[PDB]
Amino acid sequence: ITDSLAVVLQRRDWENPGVTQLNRLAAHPPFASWRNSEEARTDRPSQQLRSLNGEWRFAWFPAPEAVPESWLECDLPEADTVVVPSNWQMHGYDAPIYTNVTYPITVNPPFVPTENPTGCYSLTFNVDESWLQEGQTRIIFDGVNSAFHLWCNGRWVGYGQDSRLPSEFDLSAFLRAGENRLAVMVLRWSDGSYLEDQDMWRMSGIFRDVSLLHKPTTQISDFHVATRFNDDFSRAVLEAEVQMCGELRDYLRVTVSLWQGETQVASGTAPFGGEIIDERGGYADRVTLRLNVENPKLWSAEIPNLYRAVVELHTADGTLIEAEACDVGFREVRIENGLLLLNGKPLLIRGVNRHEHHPLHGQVMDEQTMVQDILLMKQNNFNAVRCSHYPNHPLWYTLCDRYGLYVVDEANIETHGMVPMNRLTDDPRWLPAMSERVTRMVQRDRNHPSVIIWSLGNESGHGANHDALYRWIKSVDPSRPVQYEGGGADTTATDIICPMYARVDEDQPFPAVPKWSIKKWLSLPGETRPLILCEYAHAMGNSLGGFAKYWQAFRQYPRLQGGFVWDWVDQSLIKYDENGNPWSAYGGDFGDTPNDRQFCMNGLVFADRTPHPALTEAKHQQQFFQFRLSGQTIEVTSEYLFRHSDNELLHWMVALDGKPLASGEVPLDVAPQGKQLIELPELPQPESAGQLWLTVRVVQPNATAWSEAGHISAWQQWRLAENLSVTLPAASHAIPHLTTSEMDFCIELGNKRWQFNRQSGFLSQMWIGDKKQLLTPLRDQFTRAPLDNDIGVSEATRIDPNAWVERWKAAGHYQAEAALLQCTADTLADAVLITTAHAWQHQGKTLFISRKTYRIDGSGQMAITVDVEVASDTPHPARIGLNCQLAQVAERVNWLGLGPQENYPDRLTAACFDRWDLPLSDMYTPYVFPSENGLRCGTRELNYGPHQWRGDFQFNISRYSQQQLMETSHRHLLHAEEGTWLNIDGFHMGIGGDDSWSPSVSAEFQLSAGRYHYQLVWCQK
Amino acid sequence: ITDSLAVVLQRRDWENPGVTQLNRLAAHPPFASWRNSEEARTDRPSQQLRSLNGEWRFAWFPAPEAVPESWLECDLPEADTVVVPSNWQMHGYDAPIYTNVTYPITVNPPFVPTENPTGCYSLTFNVDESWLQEGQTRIIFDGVNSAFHLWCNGRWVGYGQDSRLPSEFDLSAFLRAGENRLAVMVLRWSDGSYLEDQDMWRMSGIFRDVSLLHKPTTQISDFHVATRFNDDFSRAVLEAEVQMCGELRDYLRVTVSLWQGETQVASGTAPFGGEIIDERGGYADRVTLRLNVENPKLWSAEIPNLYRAVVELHTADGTLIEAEACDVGFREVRIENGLLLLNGKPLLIRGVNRHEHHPLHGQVMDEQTMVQDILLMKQNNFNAVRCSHYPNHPLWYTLCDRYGLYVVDEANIETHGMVPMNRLTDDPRWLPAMSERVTRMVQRDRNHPSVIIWSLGNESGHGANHDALYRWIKSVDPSRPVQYEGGGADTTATDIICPMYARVDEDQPFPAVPKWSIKKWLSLPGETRPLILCEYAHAMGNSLGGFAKYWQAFRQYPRLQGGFVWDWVDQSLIKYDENGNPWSAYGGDFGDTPNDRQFCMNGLVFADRTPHPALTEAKHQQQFFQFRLSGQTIEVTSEYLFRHSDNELLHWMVALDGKPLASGEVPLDVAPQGKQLIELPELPQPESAGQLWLTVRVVQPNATAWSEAGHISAWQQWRLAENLSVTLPAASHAIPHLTTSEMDFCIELGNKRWQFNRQSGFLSQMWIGDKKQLLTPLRDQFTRAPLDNDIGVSEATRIDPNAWVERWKAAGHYQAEAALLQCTADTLADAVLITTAHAWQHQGKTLFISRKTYRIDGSGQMAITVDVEVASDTPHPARIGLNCQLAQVAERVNWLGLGPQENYPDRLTAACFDRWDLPLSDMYTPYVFPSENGLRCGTRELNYGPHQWRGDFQFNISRYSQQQLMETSHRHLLHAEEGTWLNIDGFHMGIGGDDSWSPSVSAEFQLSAGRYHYQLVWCQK
The missing domain is CATH 2.60.40.10 (Immunoglobulins)
Structure with missing residues (x-):
């Protein structure tokens, strides 16, 4: 009755930050309750730990209130059979929302919308009579988003908040032998949502595992490990603190043993009862052992030396009550004298931020995916990862521990969308809620060696709540440093200056929270902490320009110990077309409102884990x-x-x-x-x-x-x-003939013929034999289909006049019209010489001037020589070159220049000069949001079909015109054009990337000279 | 229905530290909602603020569960008419428990006992229709102990914990015009009790006020004041930060005006909208003004210069929405260079700890009482008070602000009874609960000038929760220092070394938490903070010995800036006898179990506010x-x-x-x-x-x-x-006659006769004329009716072998038997000479030896000369002198020596040498727990009736034998004896007092010489 929805729902616990949980057990490190020490040692599986993952019954409702009391007692006719874990948006119930900053719901803390998508999960299962004789049977949910109530066998059990950490309940007294049933009601929005405003898809459900754990009545309640070293690390002490629950009986003992493989390295045994702590005594339910280890093998990301620690709770007669274990890594982390040290040497963090994202599964993680990610990272020269921006799936730490990656563990707290940012974090009333997001994380992950730094959350400004929480951690676990970027990146709540998007050399002095140039930031008066960027080098689409600048500072300044690139994977999702064909979807593609479109795609790898070209530039620099x-x-x-x-x-x-x-x-x-x-x-x-x-x-x-x-x-x-x-060259055997007309000039020599239209001034066509080669005339090009960085946050609604694209747009670049100023043919002793001049203008303003000469000789080679003049007062052009549409379509492309991969000017250090040969298909980069791509710089010779161009240029070649790219929102909608589009640039502006919401192209990479000169040689084989 | 007891009580919110409140408004400084600026300025009373204090209906129940649903709807037949505020134990419902450390209930957090005394209060009242048109009507309880649920007009409103701070609820929507009814259910025990284990009577109820406040819809939600100064304090800035609630409309303004009397000193006006704080902006609902004040009058306890600050919330057309105000004191508090400074100079704290206690009203405070206390303190040389150990009744700060006392405001957190002490404070799960006890205190009291230091609580060991909370405060209000003694007195959670009972010169090195000698503590390596004792000089009963030692260190060492004596008033309560006669009751006198007896009486003044003699010693030293x-x-x-x-x-x-x-x-x-x-x-x-x-x-x-x-x-x-x-002297005219016999020796001279019993060796009787003078022979005395300090914590059950009394007891002092060794009479030329010798022994051990000579001369004067030998190996005696019972009873006592008040050896600096004359009644000190008292030292002449004694001695005189004192638990049970008991001491041991649970008598005050000599002259007028 008091179990009734009616009664329960009444209190509206999900609209109250003062109730974050009801009847939830305490946090702790991962337990399995092995009942045999060896299994524990070898990490075998515990029969005392059972998964409830699988097929569950589910039913969706638009509001908690629309749930029927019946549900508590019996399944529902219309309940579907869903698989758990999963994100119900992944199944079709409602849409996933891709919003960045702006909260998904209306800002009225602590209220939530009345229309609040409720998911009712249920599961019928068997409990073995043995589990009910003794011990405790508890349930665990590794992740429920965003909040939920729980019933068992029709009885109300408890409630919980915090999408990213486990909630545990003791089911001990609700369970009946044999057949049991769970009813879990998951609310999409809760007061917890106010603290979960991360830039990512907004989903929901039972998205991490569900388990059952059976523990003895007298058990191990928690344990921590710690390792101290001597001056040279030749000796360590392993210190384990154990606490137990239940009745304390003098015959109780604890043994902690340290193995290295098969080899036991050290063991210690003792009975409960700590040292005197204060005026009332000590903990009788705790014991701390200390094991000495001589010449320990140290853990690092370079060499993940691990030991196994087994904690046995037994009686004195040798009988085992139960055992727990964990992997141990001997390492010391310290900030000393402005430097961050690992085992005494100073790290250089080659890291990246990574979200828990699967294009198919939404936010449900699996071992395979984790592992893939890890290996790609290690292969690509990464040392570390940041858990942007919440605690991850448990297995993650374990893998990092094992494969070797430094991890920054981060609290699930982001209130980016408040105004000001501080609003909740400065409010004592949120202190408790916040507090639990930090404390539980620590209690759970503290024993992993891979974790080397704790972070208080993300983008939640800077409030007194942070200061308290930071102090808490320092007190509780002084083994690691704490970091938090909010409020300026260098507050009193962080041990490290950890800004996001600070430039290398330029300052961005926003009021209150400027972002100094990193080199400068360090020497500000009084400053002495190390600096490591929590996010830098925004890898959105065609990006990563300037990456090297960073690497170089890192290398020259000691206190610049690296950073975390933003970010790992594209947060794109899979959608299906009219023919069951999949395609990569993004913000607003699910009718999601309001939304941030492409903003969810900033990875170095595509959602499928296939790399973006930027990835190499990283790999090489790192x-x-x-x-x-x-x-x-x-x-x-x-x-x-x-x-x-x-x-x-x-x-x-x-x-x-x-x-x-x-x-x-x-x-x-x-x-x-x-x-x-x-x-x-x-x-x-x-x-x-x-x-x-x-x-x-x-x-x-x-x-x-x-x-x-x-x-x-x-x-x-x-x-x-x-x-x-x-x-x-060898004096031409032949000599070209020029045939004039009022429409054009024709040049013939051999089977070859070239025609220049006297009205336009462009080479309109050319033949080899009877075959025409162009579909489009060869003409000057000064623009480019805007990269993500060129656009920034400019929208049709809200134009960003500073965005490159806007400037270009506004100035007429995209719609300037040519003007024949001159076009002449002259006959040389051994060649024909054409000479032209155009002016590009817009509203009576001459933007540019192009002056060429084509010179065809007895060799049947044309030499193009070009000379542009750019008006001082026009935004610098994205590029300067020519393009045309070829008639042919060949299978390969061969060139002698930088490659093999896409390379831009401020992004080409990883590329090598050589002769490359690849399939046309490989000369296009399928950035989900189409834009200029595929460029290759420093080319000296390019070959396509019978054509060969020679000189010094950058070029790109595909089946898509710039215009098509520019006009297609998704790559899946592009269609190959008639032939091959070729863009040959004498010059190209850099791509930028310091960030994707303001101009990030460094001056050295902007086409600002005014006068530009270049030459080509086109010919055949 | 969901308002039902049944439903409500179900959740058992009082057995869950995760629910500290439900629907309670935020904390803030005191509001009145004046609607006229002048009233505000002059502190007139706000018609918008109504008291619900008075006659309420009450009914007591043994468990929340025994409450009848009816109650919600209608009064109860048997409900009594009680006055509120009050402590129901004060009315008879249940008993008050006087326990110190040991929790009242059984230790099983967070559980409470099923038998849990519930008090149901109810009140029927009228709400004026105007209050319901607009604005908000909220209710406030300034103190409900320990927890409670609330209903209004049969509807459930909310819940609250924390006995010592206000809980506020918005009644806006439950109220009906005219007649309304409140039903308040107060639980004695809750999970909040675990945090309220202060050494004091354990009571309950609505013990502070109840009010109604009507605020506008658009109102002032909070405001703070701050004052900065320049190098010499010749200029200050008053800074006020205001926040509002409601709809923000551009025509809104705020004016902050500063008055000094009638004279406006400064004013500032502005509209809402703060400076940019972070990336999202600022607070649109806040405004901060800054007023410049030239040559401000500074506040101090020496001169409480105050200003009035008025905060008006109005529209721009000059219309007042509402006004708030507070008194302002310009002062700067800082720790600088190891010293605590007030307005640039270093304080010397002459303070005392004070509890909120009334012998009649229990823990209900009133203005009269507050004021009395204040004046006594100021009169007696006190500067400061510590709110041991919770936030006090609001008015308190105001009075201090006004009369001038420095106040240390302390959070209501004491978990003394846990093992170890830390147990909860180190537990993240209590972090929230604790957090609210600190934060709300600050939000409420932060604007008072008298508050100069914040304290985190008392005796709760040292946990990570403290560290966090200490950091929080520092962040929020850096204007004051924070202090906390738990865990050793010098942890990372305190800005000041603030031990309790640390001795001046001797160390007490308990494990983990030693108490170094104060002079030494300061120079421990690395230490640099100032030291101020949170409690020192335990004033329990006949105490305060050594007080001066403290004063002297304070004066010689800069970093020793004083301390807080423990404590102000005796926590005794009034009980009535068989004839409606009152008497002072203590621990266990209410059948209270378990209990700490007299331990609740350590004041400098009696519960009625009449001083203990110690008070002078303080006054003088301070x-x-x-x-x-x-x-x-x-x-x-x-x-x-x-x-x-x-x-x-x-x-x-x-x-x-x-x-x-x-x-x-x-x-x-x-x-x-x-x-x-x-x-x-x-x-x-x-x-x-x-x-x-x-x-x-x-x-x-x-x-x-x-x-x-x-x-x-x-x-x-x-x-x-x-x-x-x-x-x-003039050669005797006469000469005494000695008449021998086998029983005795008689001396006659004039009307005068003296008889010495030859079997006992004592002067058995004496006559003046026909009248006998003694009721008891004049005999040697080496003991004393044990003071509280002599006893300590020794009980009949659990004996403390170290307590002075125990030692004395064990050694036979109290039951030693005399032994005539010799007794002779001799005739001198002009006098008679008697000579005796006794041995006091116990179990064949001679403890002492007394050797006298009485010499009676023609003048009819006897000269007694005494010489004691004390065994090296026996505990030093409390005293050494004689006593006897006189037959007479006179009205006055006159002496030439120290006085006028009771004075002991380690407690006599405040006394003056002179001729004093007082009533017998005044020679007895009515310490509620009877013991040796009334001594006066350095006496040279004492006169009582016809007797006159002369020499150098200490003495005491009353109608109670030592034995009677020693055998009476309460003073009200003493009965005057036949005549007058006189104790004349050649020597007396000190009283001690550094603490009352271990030997505190300094060596200089112990009778350890072995050989003692003294002489008297007894005679008549």
């Missing part, structure tokens, strides 16, 4: 070996702090314009922080013209746990020499 | 003027920091053995921290024998607000000279 070339000696520097180059080979090689002349291989013997000298054999040197390039690669000959054999971990290339070509 | 005598020049030093001696006269005077020879009066002109020189007139000097004494007194000629005219604020006395008596 590489652990560094090179310098001096004469014919290569100096190698190791950035490893703990390990020796012991699975590393260096391959070297010399080549002249793509042609290999020499190769070597040399095994690296460099210690962490060491140098290795490498002298090269006498290097060949040819008479032939061209550039000679040295390229080196570090290879991992043997496979590791996260890499295959032959994995390349680093590389670098240098230009060694140049033999300039002092050779004049 | 005096603000200090003297030194050099020749005939008196040097006066002022300890005032801010004020000039401007109501001070110095009276001086010289006297020879009680006889006045000279007097002066001199006006003091000494500045704070200054010296004044005073040269005395040529001082007379007589030939006559005797001691010449100089005595000076400082007088307050004019009355102040807390003192009458002619109040004496200080004094000091010196001995100037001594003219020794070289005069031999």
